[PDB]
């Protein structure tokens, strides 16, 4: 069985490592169609040893594809992912447009993959934030473990906007709670995804001066104590998971190791309160991240719902 | 009444910042002394309009003084504290020597200066830790008005080369420190044990994380406070403006004297405060800390 799938914003980044994926998680795709505005037409990819052309949006028969992958900004978004899905098409959206919307699933398939199966109220499902995806991976086995009471959260990302490859703000005017609009969306991300109300989520969003790939620091207010040493060994066993020990040798210092892995590191408890849980998580590259979470989400719509 | 004042680590560059205090805040020095090893022996610095010249301490008579301020290291300042207090001389360390030692105190001015008392024990005070320092100047209203049941701080170093490491994210995974067997680092147990003292409350629990990476212009930490009871951040920003020293931001461009911003709450838990520290000189703050015990030094005990 293979599937008939567009990428939205073929020529951005995002959708170019899109196609990356696919390809390297060996995706059952028949035929591939990528789509741009007028300006980036008849561009060309390689894609599984054939060549895809990439053609204008306005154009484009959307009853050719199963399933669409869009990343090239949310007005777009907002614009097209109507159209395609009342062509029948399941649009899966690397934007904000979608996320919060009441309707809409937001999927992180290692831990809300169930909540895929409302694609039918609209036929679009929601991409997370690459900071909500990085930091979901890794506190869901702590979730599941001891309950999670309350998350307090820096995640790190260059001024410039530059570096989300690693390899070469408002104050929210309705809330009045001293937390920025992207901050605010944070919460809203992470609530959705563990369909957790109770969960108390305080994010601090800083720009560095320069930096290569994101970060985040995380603090953890479990409902039951748990041991820094129980965590690391699920996070050793969990999928999509690295988890750095830390080296007392050279030999044993990494590289980042994986495409698109969720990095996990300086995990501890707070000093005499088992309750608070410590750590650190990394994305390298930023992109495959985002783009492997998406694909993850469409290997799942497919294997389940087609 | 003027006093006789030692440097001791003259050269180096918290003592040089020490000098440029000294005269900045109008110490009543009588003579002032610069001590170095032998190497140094003959530079000079200019100090309240006067040239003074760096001589050998192997050679130095320490009776001569009544004040002296150290920064050339531990193992020194383990060697000489001892030799100048014998003389009679009141020694403010800045290393972390001696910081930890029972009959020693740990003075921050702006928070405990009653422990400046038990210089007559060893004639030795110890200055605490720059980040330290910071961090409690900022956090003492919060703890007078409400109290403190744990902090969690993360101290941040201030801008293949470091600096081209020091802007790889991957580098936030600390894989080649030295961590004690708890998890936290001698340098993050360090801030632990200094506060603990400082507030003088062993019920105080501090989670102290002290990276390298990622880096910000000045030097900044980020504070989350548990308080005893609940208070709104408009209360706690209201306080850090009656404080003198602190200058307060708003926006949420921020990290962008000693700076505090992005000041909030823990949505629905009051408990809750979150904070942003930034120092422009985080040395020159240690050399005027240090400076400052001194000056209560002179004033209430000479």
Redesign the interface.
């Known amino acids: 069985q293979q599937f008939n799938v567009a990428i939205f914003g073929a020529t951005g980044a995002v959708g170019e490592t899109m196609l990356e994926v696919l390809q390297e998680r060996e995706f059952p795709v028949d035929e591939l169609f990528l789509l741009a505005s007028e300006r980036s037409e008849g561009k060309t990819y390689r894609f599984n040893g054939k060549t895809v052309r990439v053609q204008n949006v306005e154009e484009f028969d959307w009853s050719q594809v199963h399933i669409a992958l869009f990343s090239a900004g949310g007005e777009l978004s907002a614009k097209w992912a109507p159209i395609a899905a009342e062509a029948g098409v399941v649009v899966i959206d690397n934007t904000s447009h979608f996320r919060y919307d009441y309707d809409i699933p937001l999927v992180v398939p290692e831990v809300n993959p169930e909540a895929i199966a409302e694609f039918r109220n609209r036929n679009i499902i929601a991409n997370p934030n690459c900071s909500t995806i990085q930091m979901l991976v890794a506190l869901k086995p702590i979730y599941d473990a001891v309950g999670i009471e309350?998350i307090?959260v820096?995640t790190?990302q260059s001024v410039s906007g530059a570096?989300k490859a690693?390899i070469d703000?408002?104050?929210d005017q309705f809330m009045d709670?001293?937390?920025?609009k992207e901050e605010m969306k944070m919460?809203w991300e992470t609530q959705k995804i563990f369909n957790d109300p109770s969960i108390?989520?305080?994010p601090?969003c800083?720009?560095?001066?320069?930096?290569?790939?994101?970060?985040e620091?995380v603090?953890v207010e479990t409902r039951a104590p748990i041991d820094?040493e129980q965590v690391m060994d699920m996070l050793e066993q969990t999928d999509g998971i690295e988890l750095?020990r830390?080296?007392d040798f050279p030999t044993?210092?990494?590289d980042?190791g994986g495409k698109d892995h969720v990095?996990?590191?300086?995990?501890?408890?707070?000093?005499?309160?088992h309750s608070?849980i410590?750590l650190?998580v990394?994305?390298?590259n930023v992109r495959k991240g985002a783009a492997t979470n998406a694909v993850q989400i469409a290997e799942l719509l497919v294997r389940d719902y087609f």
Not at 177 to 180: A, D, E, F, K, S
Not at 206 to 215: D, E, K, L, S, T
Not at 263 to 273: E, M, P, T, W
């Open positions: 309350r307090n820096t790190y570096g690693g703000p408002q104050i709670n001293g937390y920025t919460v108390m989520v305080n601090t800083v720009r560095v001066p320069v930096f290569y790939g994101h970060a620091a603090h820094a750095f830390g080296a044993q210092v990494r980042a990095l996990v590191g300086r995990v501890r408890n707070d000093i005499s309160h608070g410590n650190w990394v994305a390298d």
